[PDB]
Design a protein around this nucleic acid. Sequence first.
RNA 1: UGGGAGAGGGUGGUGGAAUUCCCGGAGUAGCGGUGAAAUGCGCAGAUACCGGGAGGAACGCCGAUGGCGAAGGCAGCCACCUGGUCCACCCGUGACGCUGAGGCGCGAAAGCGUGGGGAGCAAACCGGAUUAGAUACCCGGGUAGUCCACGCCCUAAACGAUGCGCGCUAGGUCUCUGGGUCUCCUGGGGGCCGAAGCUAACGCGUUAAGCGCGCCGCCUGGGGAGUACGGCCGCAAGGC
Lengths: 119, 73, 101, 88
Amino acid sequence: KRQVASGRAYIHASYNNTIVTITDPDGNPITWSSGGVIGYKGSRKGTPYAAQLAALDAAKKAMAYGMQSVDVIVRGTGAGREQAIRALQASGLQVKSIVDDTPVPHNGCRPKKKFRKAS
Amino acid sequence: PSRKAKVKATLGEFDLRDYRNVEVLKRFLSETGKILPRRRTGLSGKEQRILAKTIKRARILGLLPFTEKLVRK
Amino acid sequence: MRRYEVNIVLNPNLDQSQLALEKEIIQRALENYGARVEKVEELGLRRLAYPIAKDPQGYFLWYQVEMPEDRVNDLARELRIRDNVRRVMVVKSQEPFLANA
Amino acid sequence: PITKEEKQKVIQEFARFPGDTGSTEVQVALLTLRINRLSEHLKVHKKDHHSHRGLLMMVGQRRRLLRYLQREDPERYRALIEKLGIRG
RNA sequence: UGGGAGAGGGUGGUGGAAUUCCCGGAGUAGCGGUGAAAUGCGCAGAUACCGGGAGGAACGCCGAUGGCGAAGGCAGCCACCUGGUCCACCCGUGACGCUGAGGCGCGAAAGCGUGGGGAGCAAACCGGAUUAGAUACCCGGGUAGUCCACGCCCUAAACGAUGCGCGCUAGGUCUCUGGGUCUCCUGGGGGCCGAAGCUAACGCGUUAAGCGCGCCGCCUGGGGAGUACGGCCGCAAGGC
Ligand SMILES: [K+]
Ligand SMILES: [K+]
Ligand SMILES: [K+]
Ligand SMILES: [Mg+2]
Ligand SMILES: [Mg+2]
Ligand SMILES: [Mg+2]
Ligand SMILES: [Mg+2]
Ligand SMILES: [Mg+2]
Ligand SMILES: [Mg+2]
Ligand SMILES: [Mg+2]
Ligand SMILES: [Mg+2]
Ligand SMILES: [Mg+2]
Ligand SMILES: [Mg+2]
Ligand SMILES: [Mg+2]
Ligand SMILES: [Mg+2]
Ligand SMILES: [Mg+2]
Ligand SMILES: [Mg+2]
Ligand SMILES: [Mg+2]
Ligand SMILES: [Mg+2]
Ligand SMILES: [Mg+2]
Ligand SMILES: [Mg+2]
Ligand SMILES: [Mg+2]
Ligand SMILES: [Mg+2]
Ligand SMILES: [Mg+2]
Ligand SMILES: [Mg+2]
Ligand SMILES: [Mg+2]
Ligand SMILES: [Mg+2]
Ligand SMILES: [Mg+2]
Ligand SMILES: [Mg+2]
Ligand SMILES: [Mg+2]
Ligand SMILES: [Mg+2]
Ligand SMILES: [Mg+2]
Ligand SMILES: [Mg+2]
Ligand SMILES: [Mg+2]
Ligand SMILES: [Mg+2]
Ligand SMILES: [Mg+2]
Ligand SMILES: [Mg+2]
Ligand SMILES: [Mg+2]
Ligand SMILES: [Mg+2]
Ligand SMILES: [Mg+2]
Ligand SMILES: [Mg+2]
Ligand SMILES: [Mg+2]
Ligand SMILES: [Mg+2]
Ligand SMILES: [Mg+2]
Ligand SMILES: [Mg+2]
Ligand SMILES: [Mg+2]
């Protein structure tokens, strides 16, 4: 609708969902999808297939905006990360590159109990 | 395995306390801002301990990075 | 007194005047604090490993000096008061610990 | 800190004879220097207890030596003191 | 006297990563969470993404099987103030030593008092699930507290559950830190395996749990009981 051509694809993988966001060359989102955006409602969202689908939903909706080439950026380490990547590559969009940018503190905040017991 | 070559053998006579020689210091950081382990640096307990001090100093100055993005996956 | 090494990084966008007006107060404060300058270097512009003060670069300064330790903190506290001054790192000098040599 | 010269001063000022470095007076004078400095260090930094243990050892080592003097040469003792102005 | 290594301690500065919140941008219907879910959050536009700001707390990689400290304990970086300790020279004193009832000081966490500060986390607590019930485990919230300053409290599986000092009794191997004529000798630490020997075994073995001397502390079947009484200490909780 605005014609952007080339941009960024952000994969936010986690153990509960995969949410993809495509943005213009400088971070502003164009479209987005996720296990919830598509059918899946609960546990299924995490699954890699859902990731695959969301990834495709994202690209498809992005090509409408005239997208063609993307720069992928992966954040997260969920059960479905690597699938969204293979999804975008076969989506039609050209994967110019892949980069893992998962945030990691240099030891800041006391984690939730669920994420402790970690020496 | 850890056998690509040790960064020490790959260098020449250099001052481990020179926190400005980013030219060489940089060769001690991984494909990320991360300080390489002795298995890779080829340095010694004492040498390695001084490097750290130096690197961190360069990082504060802006000459060296604290972290970088992995390019693949 | 002791031998130190003042490091100063400042705004990389200064006209010859502003650059001299800063080096002015830099040189000044030093004298005001017993900073006997043994040497100096000015590599100037360099590409920071990360943006400092939103700027992808910085103009570097370096002075090997000798001064009253009890004032090394105040000295550096002073150098920092400037806006054009973005970094102040003072360090006790050391014999170069060679290696792989 | 205590500079070599600062130190060499007391060593002369107290040595029983030239080249005397290990006399009870010399040792008591050196300990007295360190003690006083540390005591000053601790008037400020009252929470620096790890350093205070060092003070405790010094003061102990001192009374011990002084004790030896008093027992060996009651005079040198009174003199060493009066001069240093210890105890009180 | 000359040197050395060190997260040893205190003070003041300062750095970047992340979380939360606030501001702007862009974007749209879900996010989150679980074994599965729901509570919860989101069209007053959340989640995901970019930019700016605020603030508190902690310090990734290097980190070890490492280092330092009497113990408790101690990890960005820089400066100052300061403790201990190891080595070389063989220079000075001339047994000045060891231990140590009582005393005095230090003493993790929680907890207390006064005043600050609160990002994140989280006793209580409020809810959602699970369950036969579930005053729990799992999930969404959340106050004290966790942080700082001053005082208090004085406990622990405060552990090597091994009191301190000294002398003596094979060696091999790895390691940290000095010195050397830098195969490798030497000194001080940290580990492993082991002569002799010791031990109820397990194991210990020059870092003894071996062979000895010195001094302190402590035990004397289990339960009642670390309770009662008394005394001392503490604001209290409670401690001895
Ligand atoms: K809903
Ligand atoms: K046996
Ligand atoms: K009582
Ligand atoms: Mg889910
Ligand atoms: Mg330290
Ligand atoms: Mg931040
Ligand atoms: Mg906003
Ligand atoms: Mg909420
Ligand atoms: Mg609603
Ligand atoms: Mg609702
Ligand atoms: Mg509406
Ligand atoms: Mg932001
Ligand atoms: Mg706030
Ligand atoms: Mg130790
Ligand atoms: Mg411990
Ligand atoms: Mg020292
Ligand atoms: Mg002699
Ligand atoms: Mg004689
Ligand atoms: Mg004793
Ligand atoms: Mg006695
Ligand atoms: Mg305590
Ligand atoms: Mg506490
Ligand atoms: Mg309180
Ligand atoms: Mg309060
Ligand atoms: Mg919570
Ligand atoms: Mg049941
Ligand atoms: Mg129920
Ligand atoms: Mg909870
Ligand atoms: Mg233990
Ligand atoms: Mg050994
Ligand atoms: Mg040894
Ligand atoms: Mg050894
Ligand atoms: Mg045997
Ligand atoms: Mg047995
Ligand atoms: Mg047997
Ligand atoms: Mg053994
Ligand atoms: Mg023995
Ligand atoms: Mg035994
Ligand atoms: Mg004892
Ligand atoms: Mg008893
Ligand atoms: Mg009985
Ligand atoms: Mg009993
Ligand atoms: Mg009790
Ligand atoms: Mg009372
Ligand atoms: Mg009372
Ligand atoms: Mg109790």
